[PDB]
Design a protein around this ligand. Structure first.
Ligand SMILES: Nc1nc(=O)c2cc(CCCCc3ccc(C(=O)N[C@@H](CCC(=O)O)C(=O)O)cc3)sc2[nH]1
Ligand SMILES: NCC(=O)N[C@@H]1O[C@H](COP(=O)([O-])[O-])[C@@H](O)[C@H]1O
Length: 200
């Protein structure tokens, strides 16, 4: 299966995906990395790995729909099967999401359905949970509400900050994002007709 990875920053999850998809038994290949922001570390990671990059700055398009269209055109250019959002911090439009329904994955640094949104660690710390974690899910129109593929729990330690907690949770993200990609790319897991997760 041919994979696009969308990023907005550092790209530690991108690197984990690059590493996993180069294993001999990988059912996924990363054929394009797309960033909405320029000069981000994730782009260096892709180039260093010999993967094509495209920057599509969302601040030259009149609205959300035509920004996504610019993404979609590139996805078509590279005959993409699966899209991974890996620290991509832009909300995608309804039609774009519907087109890629069952073919687009996202990593989120909480145990969904807890702490939806862009500041999950802040929320987890404010709430006072002693167990948080991360989630890979299919992307649906409503943010962080799509069908869950894998999760991993991660303890919160006394005195944690966003810095120390995100560091711990990223270790788990780097495990379940590649595992989830392999499950979907091999056809082992799919979004079923009834919308629920189907394990074939
Ligand atoms: N349809 C859709 N479903 C998803 O499940 C999903 C997950 C994504 C991956 C990211 C999920 C977390 C996230 C939340 C909010 C924001 C955020 O700040 N959004 C802004 C607009 C974009 C921006 O300016 O940043 C806003 O609405 O104000 C950034 C990131 S994108 C996505 N799109
Ligand atoms: N879905 C919103 C969100 O908070 N995403 C988070 O952004 C980070 C990107 O790190 P990376 O650039 O090193 O992969 C990841 O921790 C991911 O869970």
């Amino acid at each position: 299966a041919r994979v696009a990875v969308l990023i907005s920053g550092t790209g530690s999850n991108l690197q984990a995906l690059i590493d996993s998809t180069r294993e001999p038994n990988s059912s996924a290949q990363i054929d394009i990395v797309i960033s909405n922001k320029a000069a981000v570390a994730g782009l260096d990671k892709a180039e260093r790995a010999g993967i094509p990059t495209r920057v599509i700055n969302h601040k030259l398009y009149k609205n959300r729909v035509e920004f996504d269209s610019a993404i979609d055109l590139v996805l078509e250019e590279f005959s993409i099967d699966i899209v991974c959002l890996a620290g991509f911090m832009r909300i995608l439009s309804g039609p774009f999401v519907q087109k890629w329904n069952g073919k687009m994955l996202n990593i989120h640094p909480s145990l969904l359905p807890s702490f939806k949104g862009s500041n999950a660690h802040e929320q987890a710390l404010e709430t006072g949970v002693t167990v948080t974690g991360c989630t890979v899910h299919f992307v649906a129109e409503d943010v962080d509400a799509g069908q869950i593929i894998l999760q991993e729990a991660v303890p919160v330690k006394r005195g944690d900050t966003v810095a120390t907690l995100s560091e711990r949770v990223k270790l788990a993200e780097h495990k379940i994002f590649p595992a989830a990609l392999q499950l979907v790319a091999s056809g082992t897991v799919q979004l079923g007709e009834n919308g629920k997760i189907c394990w074939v």
